[PDB]
Design a protein around this ligand. Structure first.
Ligand SMILES: O=C(O)c1cc(C(=O)O)n(Cc2ccccc2Cl)n1
Length: 220
């Protein structure tokens, strides 16, 4: 059973990535999977199922829809927009939203209203996460843990993005991607097809950073 998000949930998944990026001392246990969900929503359900079947994997496709979940937090009833995911519980998704909301209030208290590029809903949050995946892919292709080189290459290449996001923690995010590619090798095929299609055309500064990072996995 594999979740195959379609184009319709791409904005939702990007916001989930953004929620983690604004979280102070964020738990990046699910970032590898969330990043892979974003790549699949960019490829679309049809292309994702095609990649897996062609790569030889058997796939029981799970439809991904947005649902409103009612949950009691601090005595008060709250409405959360969550995705129907077999790989990520409603509880985990809601806790990511709760923790990010705590960080966001701290930000308001520190600088007043937050600029677009510093928010959880900035359009490049998913791509920022996928830039770490591009660094991990290089070290899995070049030979069994080039983790120190990933962190150091990340602090240079993603210096502007680290300044924008407190939860952009290269060590934790790289560990999460290493873990998902080891545990679910079918995600390597999905990421490689995503990277080939993306490096054809953007776009934004982050889309440009990603294409250069991805292209490096082959040449100079
Ligand atoms: O004015 C806004 O756009 C606004 C308000 C809030 C908030 O009250 O947390 N936030 C942060 C936010 C909103 C929804 C889901 C997660 C978060 Cl962190 N943005």
């Amino acid at each position: 059973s594999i979740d195959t998000p379609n184009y319709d949930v791409q904005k939702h998944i990007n916001k989930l990535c953004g929620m983690l990026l604004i979280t102070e001392d964020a738990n990046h246990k699910f970032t590898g999977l969330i990043g892979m969900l974003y790549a699949m929503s960019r490829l679309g359900r049809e292309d994702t199922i095609k990649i897996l079947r062609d790569a030889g994997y058997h796939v029981k496709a799970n439809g991904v829809d947005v649902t409103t979940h009612r949950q009691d937090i601090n005595g008060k009833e709250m409405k959360f927009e969550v995705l129907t995911l077999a790989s990520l519980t409603t509880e985990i998704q809601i806790n990511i939203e709760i923790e990010s909301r705590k960080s966001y209030k701290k930000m308001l208290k520190e600088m007043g209203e937050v600029a677009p590029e510093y928010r959880h809903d900035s359009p490049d949050c998913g791509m920022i996460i996928l830039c770490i995946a591009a660094l991990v892919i290089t070290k899995l292709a070049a030979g069994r843990s080039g983790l120190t080189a990933v962190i150091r290459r990340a602090n240079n290449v993603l210096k502007n993005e680290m300044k924008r996001y407190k939860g952009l923690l290269p060590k934790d995010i790289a560990n999460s991607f290493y873990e998902v590619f080891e545990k679910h090798p079918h995600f390597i095929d999905v990421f490689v097809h995503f990277g080939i299609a993306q490096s054809s055309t953007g776009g934004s500064r982050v889309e440009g950073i990603f294409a250069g990072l991805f292209m490096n996995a082959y040449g100079l």
